[model samples]
Structures are given as structure tokens and as C-alpha cells.
Target: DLSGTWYVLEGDPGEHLVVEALGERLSGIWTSRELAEAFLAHHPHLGMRVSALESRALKEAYLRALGMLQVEAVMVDYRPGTHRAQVARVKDLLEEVRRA
Candidate 1:
């Protein structure tokens, strides 16, 4: 489940890259640091920065804050032009964290 570090992209405004999917706001998360860096490198003009949630506590906090940010889903291993990865609810992710 939710363990170790996970990655996300933060925009220039200090906010995560929240995208609209099916009328809901979702944030992208990466299980691999290299993949996250590659996503940023490919989309050079997006001005997004990549950072990792190093601790389990930070991951829990991030997931909790997504609800506060009105983000309905977490897009895992997100890539542009393709959304093959899983899009999970924030509360569900939180539940997994708590179960860990």
C-alpha cells in the first residue's frame, strides 16, 4: 500500500498540477522519481517542479490536503496524452495509508 516516497509535480504558484477529468479535479502522483522527472522534462513549458513525499507522514498529509484542495482523485503514474494509470479517490488512498 502507501509506503516510502512518492512524487508529485508542483507548479510555479506552489500548487500541485491539478487537472480536470470527467468534471472532477485530480492531481498526478508518481511512484517513480525518474518517471516524474521525465514528465517534467517532456513538458518543459508547463513550469512544473517535481518533489517527493519522502515520509509516510508527508504522504498522508498530502492525501489529506487533496480533499481540502477539492481534488477528487489522485492520478497515479500520470502521463500526458494518456491516462492508463489508476485514478483513485483521496479518501480511499487515506484509508490505505491508515491501514498500513
Candidate 2:
């Protein structure tokens, strides 16, 4: 229903946030400072989070987050329980970012 980079909270799996970036400008929902900081740690270039909507960009973010697990699975060669652990780690980070 929205666009831009959508981020789902790890602690609240059903809760999601969105951020829209246009060139260097950004617009979207606002999360906690800690959450923003955590995201910034990984995504320093991402612009600010404001109250705005960019459906396409948000959609991509959601897709990326949704596909993160599958992408990681193919990127690494895991043996048995290793892959699930990695996936769980990603999920854990999501929760951390969400709650931050």
C-alpha cells in the first residue's frame, strides 16, 4: 500500500516502517533514534525519515527486507543448521532495529 524503503520491526514482526529516498532527499515514517542509528550504521547514505509516501521506493525496501533471507542463503554455503542460524540472526537484527 506504500512505496520507498519499508522496514519491519523485528520485535513486532507485523509492524513495518517506510522511508522514501529521492536522490539525496528522503521522506517517510519516523522510527526511534536508536532504530535510525542502527539502520544508519548499515545504511549511512540513507536520508532522513519524515512524513511522506513514495510507493515504489518503499516497495523495494520491503522486497529487499523480505528477500534478505533468501539472498543470504544463496550468498553463503551453509551446512545443515548453519543456514537457519544465519536466517535467525538476520531476524534477530530486524527485531533489534525495530526495537532500537
Candidate 3:
């Protein structure tokens, strides 16, 4: 029920991340930062930057905490090159703090 194409507008910019920081609204979550960088490399002008850790353990903890959750773990990126993520399943929880 919680899966669809939700438009995250510029003003509302989910999870304290500004759309402008993203450069041009071109973002996605990959299995790893290497993959992200690999894609970014193709677009030098965009200048994308992804997190080194991408919070793998933190996401795992969330699944563990919420026992009934069946969410596919994903990294949330914004348009342009907002490599910093706001983790979620199709934009469910946008502001959950992760373990450092």
C-alpha cells in the first residue's frame, strides 16, 4: 500500500536536505557508494557525492527494532547530487536519525 511515485517538492525538501544542494533533481539509491560514484563519474558536470558508509548497520537496526516491518532497505538520494540520504521505502520515514 505504501509504494508509488511521490513527488517531493523543492520547498518541502524531505529530511532537512535542500533540493538546491542536489544540483538538478537527479538522484537514486544504489546497493553501494561505489555504484553511486560509478554513475556519478559519467556525469562530471553534475558533481555527485555519496556517503562512504551509507548507514547499512543503522538501517538493519531499524528493521530489527520494528519487528513487523518488511521494508526493502534502500539509500535515499535527492536530485542533482545530494549524496547524503534520507532513508525510506518510497518516502515513508523521512526524518529518522541514524546511528553514527
Candidate 4:
């Protein structure tokens, strides 16, 4: 079983996502950007620069892609015993992204 705590993505230096998978079950997605901002808001000295989407179209597409991925992940059958399951899931997500 591919059960472990791992980072699935790191788009920026401080902003990234971590996912924990136990067998075929995924814990959840964690985002550092919002958490970091909340912390920085409380402490101004943190000097955090939160990234934002300047283009509305780009933002909408990104959100749509994310929503699709979330739905697909939940709907797909993940076999923890299979080595290719995770890779196949990612490939499927990429195919969806390309279709968008």
C-alpha cells in the first residue's frame, strides 16, 4: 500500500500543498497560502507577499480545473496495492486539464 505523508505540489517557495494517503484513503488537501496570510495578518513583521491572480479568466479556469480534479479524485477508484494507481490518477487529471 502507498500509505505515507507526502507533498503533492509546490507551486511557490512557501505556498504549497501536502497530502496524506493511508492505503486508498486520502486525508485531505492542505494549503499554506491562506494559513500563512492569516498568520502574517496577525504579525505584520512577517513580510509575506501573497500571490494573486491578475486575470479573471485565468482565475476562473484554474478554479474550474481544481474543482474537476477534486471531483475526479473522489470518484475514481484508487487501488493502494497497485503501484500505478497514483500515477494513473495524475495522468487522468492531466488529461482533464488539457481538455479544459
Candidate 5:
């Protein structure tokens, strides 16, 4: 019964697409494939796959992996050339979904 937008930018199997911005390493978590697709317009090869996280465990693993990989923040539902994205630290971002 799980149905919702659960998208992520995965370059390789289990590998995430990390981008640099403001001197910090950042990853992305889009609400939809279209948003991730839009964000990747500026950088074509980034989004090797817009993976749909079909389970809760996979989503948690992805976020936790980012922190271990030295990722600083996550661009939530970001689009290229758009300033409406929200950034959150890896742990904080994880906890946001973890606790609630």
C-alpha cells in the first residue's frame, strides 16, 4: 500500500550523484522524476538513473550512505536555475524522516 513520490539521483548502482555548491558537497533527493530530470538538464550525465525508492529501508540507507561519503547537505526537490530548494544536513535530513 505504499504509494507516493520517492525519487533519488543514482549514478551507479548504490552510488549517488554528489554535486558541489557553495564550497560544500551536496546530494539531491527529488520528489519526482520530472524534478530530478529538470535539475539534470544543466548536467546531463549526472542522473544515470532517477531511482524510485520503493521501500523505506532503501530510502534510509541512501541517506545514511551520504553522511558516510562526506556529503554535507541534500538539495530537497531541487531544479536547476531554481532557488526554491531546501538544504539540510545529512544527519538532520535523516532524522527528519527517521523520527517522524
Candidate 6:
């Protein structure tokens, strides 16, 4: 959930990992793990895997990961065709931030 200008970083290995996490609504880097896990559990995607590594700034690092993963991980769960609703759920988590 961004209010003002947000910065994104690139060229990192873990970035993709974060993307998968976002798609699963497990982007706890910005929010609480309880929220992230709940988001993931409710997320349409099944068995979405998140990196064991924890983030320092829940929002900032997560935003960077979201941007990086967005390009490569275009395929998401939003569309029923994808059948990966979990992916879309994670993306939805990011949207919640803005709502916050």
C-alpha cells in the first residue's frame, strides 16, 4: 500500500522468489506474517512457497520484490484459466497495502 513515490530495485536473485510469494499473498515483508500467512491460506493458489528468509522492512523490501517479480511472473492466479488463484491472492495482498 503506497501513498507517495515508491522506489523499486532490480537485478537480484531473491527478487523472483518474492514474486512467487506475492502471487500467494505471502508478502509478509511489508505486512505481518499472520496477515501474510492468512492471505496465503485464503489465496486461491495452492501450496504457494515463500522464502524462509525474513524481511527487515516489511513494506519496502516487499515492494522491490513485487516489482522485480511482476515482469517474469506475469502468469498469475487471478484468471481462473490460470487456476492459480493463489498467485492472484498474493497480488491482492499488495493491493491491501494501498488500502491501508
Candidate 5 clashes between residue pairs 3 or more apart in a chain or in different chains: none
Per-model TM values vs. the true structure = 0.82, 0.20, 0.31, 0.25, 0.78, 0.28
**How close to the true structure is residue 30 of candidate 2, measured as C-alpha lDDT?**
22
Per residue, candidate 3 scores C-alpha lDDT tens digits across 27-48 of: 2444445555665565464334
The alpha-carbon root-mean-square deviation between model 6 and the true structure, to one decimal in Å, is: 9.8
* Distance from true location, Cα of 36 in model 2, Å: 27
Ranking by lDDT: 1, 5, 6, 3, 4, 2
The CA lDDT at 92 in model 1 is 82
lDDT of 1 by residue, 41-76 (tens): 877777789988887787887887787789979877
Which lDDT value does model 6 have at 45?
44
Clashing pairs in model 3, backbone N/Cα/C closer than 3 A = 22-81, 24-80, 25-79, 25-80, 26-79, 26-80
Worst 10 residues of 3 by lDDT: 8-17
RMSD of each: 2.4, 14.1, 12.2, 12.5, 3.4, 9.8
* lDDT of each residue in 53-94, candidate 4, tens digit only: 334443334334445444223212222244554322433444
- Clash count for candidate 2 is 7
**Pairs of residues at least 3 apart in sequence or in different chains that clash in candidate 4:** none
- Comparing 2 with 4 on lDDT, the higher-scoring candidate is 4
- Report the lDDT tens digits of candidate 2 across residue range 20-98: 2222211222233443345445544434332221355543454355444332211111123434421222333334334
Error of 1 at 2 (Å): 4.2
TM-score of 6: 0.28
Clashes of 3: 6
Model 5 lDDT per residue over 1-100, tens place: 1135558778768788887986899988887778777766657755477788766677778877887778979878876555766887877767656542
For residue 4, model 2's alpha carbon misses the true position, in angstroms, by 13
Better of 4 and 5 by lDDT: 5
